[PDB]
Amino acid sequence: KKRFTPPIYQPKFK
Amino acid sequence: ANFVSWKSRTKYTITPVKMRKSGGRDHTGRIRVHGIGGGHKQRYRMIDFLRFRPEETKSGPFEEKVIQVRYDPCRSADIALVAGGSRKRWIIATENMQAGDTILNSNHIGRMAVAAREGDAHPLGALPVGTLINNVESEPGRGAQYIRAAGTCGVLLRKVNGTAIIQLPSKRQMQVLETCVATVGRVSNVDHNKRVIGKAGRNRWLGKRPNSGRWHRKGGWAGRKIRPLPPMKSYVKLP
Amino acid sequence: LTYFSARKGKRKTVKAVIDRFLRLHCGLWVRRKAGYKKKLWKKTPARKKRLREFVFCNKTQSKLLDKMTTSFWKRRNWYVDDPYQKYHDRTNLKV
Amino acid sequence: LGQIYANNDKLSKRLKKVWKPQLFEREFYSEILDKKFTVTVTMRTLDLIDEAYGLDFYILKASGEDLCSKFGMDLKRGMLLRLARQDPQLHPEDPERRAAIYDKYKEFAIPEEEAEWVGLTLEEAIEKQRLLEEKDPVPLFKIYVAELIQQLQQQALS
RNA sequence: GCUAAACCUAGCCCCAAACCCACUCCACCUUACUACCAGACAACCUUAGCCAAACCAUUUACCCAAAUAAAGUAUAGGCGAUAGAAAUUGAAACCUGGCGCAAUAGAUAUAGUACCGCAAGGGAAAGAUGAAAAAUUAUAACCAAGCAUAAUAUAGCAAGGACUAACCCCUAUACCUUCUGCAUAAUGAAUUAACUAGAAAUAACUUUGCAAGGAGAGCCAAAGCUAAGACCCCCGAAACCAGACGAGCUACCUAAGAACAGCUAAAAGAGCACACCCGUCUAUGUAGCAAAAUAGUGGGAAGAUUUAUAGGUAGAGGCGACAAACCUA
RNA sequence: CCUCCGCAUAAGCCUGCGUCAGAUUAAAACACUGAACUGACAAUUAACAGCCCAAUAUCUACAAUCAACCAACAAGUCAUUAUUACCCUCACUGUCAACCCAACACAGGCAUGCUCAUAAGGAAAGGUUAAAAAAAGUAAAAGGAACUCGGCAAAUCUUACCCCGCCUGUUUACCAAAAACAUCACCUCUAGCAUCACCAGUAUUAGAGGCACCGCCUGCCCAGUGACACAUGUUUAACGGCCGCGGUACCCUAACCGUGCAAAGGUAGCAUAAUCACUUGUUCCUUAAAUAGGGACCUGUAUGAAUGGCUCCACGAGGGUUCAGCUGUCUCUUACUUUUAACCAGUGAAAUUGACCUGCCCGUGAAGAGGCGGGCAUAACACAGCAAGACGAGAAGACCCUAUGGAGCUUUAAUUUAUUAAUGCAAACAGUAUACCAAACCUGCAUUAAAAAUUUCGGUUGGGGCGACCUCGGAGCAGAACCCAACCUCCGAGCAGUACAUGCUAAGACUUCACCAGUCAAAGCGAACCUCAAUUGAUCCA
Numbered sequence A: 001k002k003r004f005t006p007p008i009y010q011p012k013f014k
Numbered sequence B: 001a002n003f004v005s006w007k008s009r010t011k012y013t014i015t016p017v018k019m020r021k022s023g024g025r026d027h028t029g030r031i032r033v034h035g036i037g038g039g040h041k042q043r044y045r046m047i048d049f050l051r052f053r054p055e056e057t058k059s060g061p062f063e064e065k066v067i068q069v070r071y072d073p074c075r076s077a078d079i080a081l082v083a084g085g086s087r088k089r090w091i092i093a094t095e096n097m098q099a100g101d102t103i104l105n106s107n108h109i110g111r112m113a114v115a116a117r118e119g120d121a122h123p124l125g126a127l128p129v130g131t132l133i134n135n136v137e138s139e140p141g142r143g144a145q146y147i148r149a150a151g152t153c154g155v156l157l158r159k160v161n162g163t164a165i166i167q168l169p170s171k172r173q174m175q176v177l178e179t180c181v182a183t184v185g186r187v188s189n190v191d192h193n194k195r196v197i198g199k200a201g202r203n204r205w206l207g208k209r210p211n212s213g214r215w216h217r218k219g220g221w222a223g224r225k226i227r228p229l230p231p232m233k234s235y236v237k238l239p
Numbered sequence C: 001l002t003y004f005s006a007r008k009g010k011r012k013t014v015k016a017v018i019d020r021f022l023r024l025h026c027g028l029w030v031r032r033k034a035g036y037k038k039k040l041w042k043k044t045p046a047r048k049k050r051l052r053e054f055v056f057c058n059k060t061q062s063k064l065l066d067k068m069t070t071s072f073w074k075r076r077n078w079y080v081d082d083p084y085q086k087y088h089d090r091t092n093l094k095v
Numbered sequence D: 001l002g003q004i005y006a007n008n009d010k011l012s013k014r015l016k017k018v019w020k021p022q023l024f025e026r027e028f029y030s031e032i033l034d035k036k037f038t039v040t041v042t043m044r045t046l047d048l049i050d051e052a053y054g055l056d057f058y059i060l061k062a063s064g065e066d067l068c069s070k071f072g073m074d075l076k077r078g079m080l081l082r083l084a085r086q087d088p089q090l091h092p093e094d095p096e097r098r099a100a101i102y103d104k105y106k107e108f109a110i111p112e113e114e115a116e117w118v119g120l121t122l123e124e125a126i127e128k129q130r131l132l133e134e135k136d137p138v139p140l141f142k143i144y145v146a147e148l149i150q151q152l153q154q155q156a157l158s
Numbered sequence E: 001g002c003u004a005a006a007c008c009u010a011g012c013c014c015c016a017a018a019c020c021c022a023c024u025c026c027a028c029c030u031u032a033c034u035a036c037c038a039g040a041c042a043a044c045c046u047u048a049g050c051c052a053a054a055c056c057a058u059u060u061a062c063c064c065a066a067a068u069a070a071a072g073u074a075u076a077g078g079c080g081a082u083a084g085a086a087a088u089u090g091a092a093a094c095c096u097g098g099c100g101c102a103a104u105a106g107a108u109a110u111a112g113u114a115c116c117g118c119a120a121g122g123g124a125a126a127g128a129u130g131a132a133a134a135a136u137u138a139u140a141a142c143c144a145a146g147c148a149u150a151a152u153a154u155a156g157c158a159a160g161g162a163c164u165a166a167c168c169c170c171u172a173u174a175c176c177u178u179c180u181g182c183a184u185a186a187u188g189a190a191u192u193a194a195c196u197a198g199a200a201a202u203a204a205c206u207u208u209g210c211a212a213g214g215a216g217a218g219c220c221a222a223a224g225c226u227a228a229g230a231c232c233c234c235c236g237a238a239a240c241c242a243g244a245c246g247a248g249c250u251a252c253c254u255a256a257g258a259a260c261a262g263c264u265a266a267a268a269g270a271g272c273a274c275a276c277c278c279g280u281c282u283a284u285g286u287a288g289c290a291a292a293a294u295a296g297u298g299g300g301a302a303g304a305u306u307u308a309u310a311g312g313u314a315g316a317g318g319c320g321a322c323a324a325a326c327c328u329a
Numbered sequence F: 001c002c003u004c005c006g007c008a009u010a011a012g013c014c015u016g017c018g019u020c021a022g023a024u025u026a027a028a029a030c031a032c033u034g035a036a037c038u039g040a041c042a043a044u045u046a047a048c049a050g051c052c053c054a055a056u057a058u059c060u061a062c063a064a065u066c067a068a069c070c071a072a073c074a075a076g077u078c079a080u081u082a083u084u085a086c087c088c089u090c091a092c093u094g095u096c097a098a099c100c101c102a103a104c105a106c107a108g109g110c111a112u113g114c115u116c117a118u119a120a121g122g123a124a125a126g127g128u129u130a131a132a133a134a135a136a137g138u139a140a141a142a143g144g145a146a147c148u149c150g151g152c153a154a155a156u157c158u159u160a161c162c163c164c165g166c167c168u169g170u171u172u173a174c175c176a177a178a179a180a181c182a183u184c185a186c187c188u189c190u191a192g193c194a195u196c197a198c199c200a201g202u203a204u205u206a207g208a209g210g211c212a213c214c215g216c217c218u219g220c221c222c223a224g225u226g227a228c229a230c231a232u233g234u235u236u237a238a239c240g241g242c243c244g245c246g247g248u249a250c251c252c253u254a255a256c257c258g259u260g261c262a263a264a265g266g267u268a269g270c271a272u273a274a275u276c277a278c279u280u281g282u283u284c285c286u287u288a289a290a291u292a293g294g295g296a297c298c299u300g301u302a303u304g305a306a307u308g309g310c311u312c313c314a315c316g317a318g319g320g321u322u323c324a325g326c327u328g329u330c331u332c333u334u335a336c337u338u339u340u341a342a343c344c345a346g347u348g349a350a351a352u353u354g355a356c357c358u359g360c361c362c363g364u365g366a367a368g369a370g371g372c373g374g375g376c377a378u379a380a381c382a383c384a385g386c387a388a389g390a391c392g393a394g395a396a397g398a399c400c401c402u403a404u405g406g407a408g409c410u411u412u413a414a415u416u417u418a419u420u421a422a423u424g425c426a427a428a429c430a431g432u433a434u435a436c437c438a439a440a441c442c443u444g445c446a447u448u449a450a451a452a453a454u455u456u457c458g459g460u461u462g463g464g465g466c467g468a469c470c471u472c473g474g475a476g477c478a479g480a481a482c483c484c485a486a487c488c489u490c491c492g493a494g495c496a497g498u499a500c501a502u503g504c505u506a507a508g509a510c511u512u513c514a515c516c517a518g519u520c521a522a523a524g525c526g527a528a529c530c531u532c533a534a535u536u537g538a539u540c541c542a
């Protein structure tokens, strides 16, 4: 199939 | 699902009441009848199907007068408002009914038959054998339900002693009590099957979605069934 | 065999071992040869007599049957009319 | 709401089956209350009524763990109150019938202070206890003038 | 010596005891944080499932009545992996701590804060001088990974043997593993600091004590009984059920509105063509403007067209002009 | 210089480039000081849209489109009456902005009015040189598609032929936008009918299905399935199917006859086609050169008449070819501008890294060596371009195989009808002269069509399926005690011809490399005086 992974955003504290 | 019906009028009137389309949505909201949805806005007319009805402080027969023949989008046949007395009620029009006509709504059954026209209405007990009738009832004082489309008509077969067998357009026999009022003649707006559609725009305007695109394999019910005529259903209650 | 139960936390036994074997106090298990009651018309009388004998087990089999049981089945019973009473104690043993 | 196997064997499929009792909408006649009621009675209830020789006996003899219904407890409490308060059941001009009815049901006679709390639930009992223990707050002016007159009488009579 | 390293207290877990609480005035069931108007309908229901029996369809402690021996005994159980009582002697009221810890440990918590989605929900690091900061003083410095101080000097898994001196002379194919055989061009790795991975029964071995008896009721015994020591890992999937959430993007429907210059207008679900609906191809980028863009060549553009507002159809399903297409990347 | 923009309304957190001090530090991709700031000062005042309507009964069929001719069909967006009671009156929500949804100050998206370019609004360029490479723009001596599978950006403006689909349209949001799904025409089946969609409808109607107009037509079948009658039958435009051989004159393709089967032994049509391999078919044309394209043939043994067969009026971002004229795709590339390229000023990554003091050849190794042997090679350190290698970077490969790890689809693979309609029985009502009738609504048992509550899909297979096998014995491999395998080559066995002392106990051994199993036998009581080589079946339960 059409394999795809969504990106993950880090918290806005670093 | 706040689904409320638009049939909120317990009094008969003449002004066309606005109706709301459904598209196959019941009280839950799921589509249960496919092929309905998206059409041109229409207005509902309160059509009085009961032919003979006495007015206030009335009992005997009364005369009527056809005024103007219009059209009803809720059905195939056309309607025509017929005035008479001190009230006006919508009834189903018949063939060869124009402006300035005179019709009779009688009820007294006579000894012999009555050579009525194709506009007036009389009980089945005073009609000759072999007469094209329409809008036949099932119970005395119930209302016309059978044979009400465009051009449909029935012919009287025979009489026994208190019943009246009426030949239905489906080639099926059906008897009814003698004290039932039925109209005489054929319904207007003939040649309805010859109406060429032309394009899908007409079907979309009428409010009919296209059929499903899934290829269904025909089972065992797709073959031709050469079956005999079903027996005559009786509505006369016998003790 | 459930080494630790959920109510008492003890050790459970296998009732099949008790119903199919018989442990003696010396450390031997008495069993029965299978097929001693089925299809006896095609077997020689010598085989029929051999199948109807109390045969002892081996070492690994006895160890397995002991591990499948607890300390209750490894005691010494003193029945009134025990036909296997003379087989509990084993004399004349030199390593 | 139980479970039933297939062909009455545990080596098949465990299906679920719920039995329903039979309901016969009949009509009775209570002698203590003198009023007919339409109750969808079953068969075991009719058998118990026939064995108890009437409906009033079946209602008054069976305890709360046998009726399994609120209407039964209400009828029991009503009959107990009618037998305790000695209220005129029918009407005057013929007290012999009422006397015979009261004499027929004399092997119980629960007092009035205990028959009013028969069949009531917890919420109804709490509501009744709150209504009995309502009492609008009495103004403190009456208590103050009572204490004042008591004090003046005590200091004057001495 | 710059970067940066340690400085204990909010307290955190379980015991014994004790049963623990909820309006200062206003607002809180409609668009909660809204002072003020005419259909009163709203609960009373076998939980299921995973695993195990090397599959799995019977079965699988979890059921909320104090210990123990009976006893894992009779029993139930594709009589098999397992489950499991009862009858019976019996069950000494009252005392304020940690052979646990100190911010990567201990509750996630200074806090259910920021942040993500319309929504249920998920959810993380924080604070170090001092008696006198109303002592802004002069000091206390010294250790890891990164740097200058103080770059390179021919030759070679960075190493060893060595001489008066770094190289020059000789030898020598990184580390753990599935593998007979691995540095192989197979797998893992940039370092430092903190954390992380062998928990336990019947039967066995050794050493005290007593002894035909041992043992603080119950159990065993033709040299036995009691006690102690000794022992059996971690992390990583697709699947199923139960309780709640979504049609604001997209599929369909409903009620009230808006949009389409100009020319040819053959009467038209006509043509070209603005704005508008979708995107057949070229070129640019794939950590870009963008988790799907840029101009034309494109089809439609008086209707089977598009759109602002409000409502409904949801998983044992919704919808479907049928792509197994869509249901918040 | 642009304006493909701006101003308002609609939706949206509400204070988000006004002043003051700090501007030493902190966010501007660098600075001034300010659209990525700390504290204090206060903007917006309604007439704009809302915040709405006292009841009892009754009334409202001649559209809009300048609505006046005409003409319709999709049959349509706007109105009151009689009675009772009511003369207190201007309160409330916002009027700022450079602003919303996408993690952002993003070349993305947003509904209507206004002049469709103006009176709204902004700057492609930081500087230095003109490296190579790449992208966007003008044209070129001769050929104008001769390069490429194909007219693939590009400008001239372009005709005819074939297939497919009637057309418009829509579908795989994000690699296929199509011949794919739909559309009017046609055909089949079901239903005698009143309140919640179907339908406020009536057998010219409604629902369930197959192709999809107009022209020629749809020839056969209930042996098998289902459906309808339970009359043994009907149904196929319901699931599906319409032969083979021999005799057959000179040559294929046969006229005809015989034979066996069955519902008929391919009807019409069309084509070497979107059509199994033979197939680059005979042949004509388009080119000088043509498995490209069109025309007449079916041995098409596998096309075929609603799984519909073919021309035809119009059309297609669907798939292929060509004619008159032209485009640097090429022979053979070139002249300029911008992005970009090289240096200066700063913010400043991502993937990736065992350490490197890192050259080549021959040969070897886990089979492709810069680190191993022998040779060749060698002062050190940066900048500017290309890819030959370091089996270089991104995804525990989507292709092959294993898994008693899953999921989707379809059943004539397994437990069962848990929910309908039909049935038969039992209780529940009421009449009825030793007999019949069993109405409307509840309960339990068993059956028939739809759903379903669950599951698995054995093993070796010189990679897997197909080929072959699934237990045991013998002959050589294994030669003279014993054991030893192959998908190495051969015979077989699932029994038998005759008496039941083919009775009961009891020392000692072999043991198919373990166990479960099998076999011989001293002696006694009892009695007159056993053959063959494998020749077979355990637990539970009955």
Ligand SMILES: [Mg+2]
Binding pocket: B211
């Ligand atoms: Mg159709």
Ligand SMILES: [Mg+2]
Binding pocket: B212, B213, B214, B215, B216
């Ligand atoms: Mg279809």
Ligand SMILES: [Mg+2]
Binding pocket: E052
């Ligand atoms: Mg399992």
Ligand SMILES: [Mg+2]
Binding pocket: none
């Ligand atoms: Mg007990």
Ligand SMILES: [Mg+2]
Binding pocket: E103
């Ligand atoms: Mg912490």
Ligand SMILES: [Mg+2]
Binding pocket: E108
């Ligand atoms: Mg934490």
Ligand SMILES: [Mg+2]
Binding pocket: none
């Ligand atoms: Mg250091």
Ligand SMILES: [Mg+2]
Binding pocket: E155
């Ligand atoms: Mg060297």
Ligand SMILES: [Mg+2]
Binding pocket: E176
């Ligand atoms: Mg290690």
Ligand SMILES: [Mg+2]
Binding pocket: E178
């Ligand atoms: Mg591995």
Ligand SMILES: [Mg+2]
Binding pocket: E179
């Ligand atoms: Mg290998």
Ligand SMILES: [Mg+2]
Binding pocket: none
């Ligand atoms: Mg390696």
Ligand SMILES: [Mg+2]
Binding pocket: E186, E187
């Ligand atoms: Mg590997």
Ligand SMILES: [Mg+2]
Binding pocket: none
């Ligand atoms: Mg690596």
Ligand SMILES: [Mg+2]
Binding pocket: E247
């Ligand atoms: Mg919507």
Ligand SMILES: [Mg+2]
Binding pocket: none
């Ligand atoms: Mg659609």
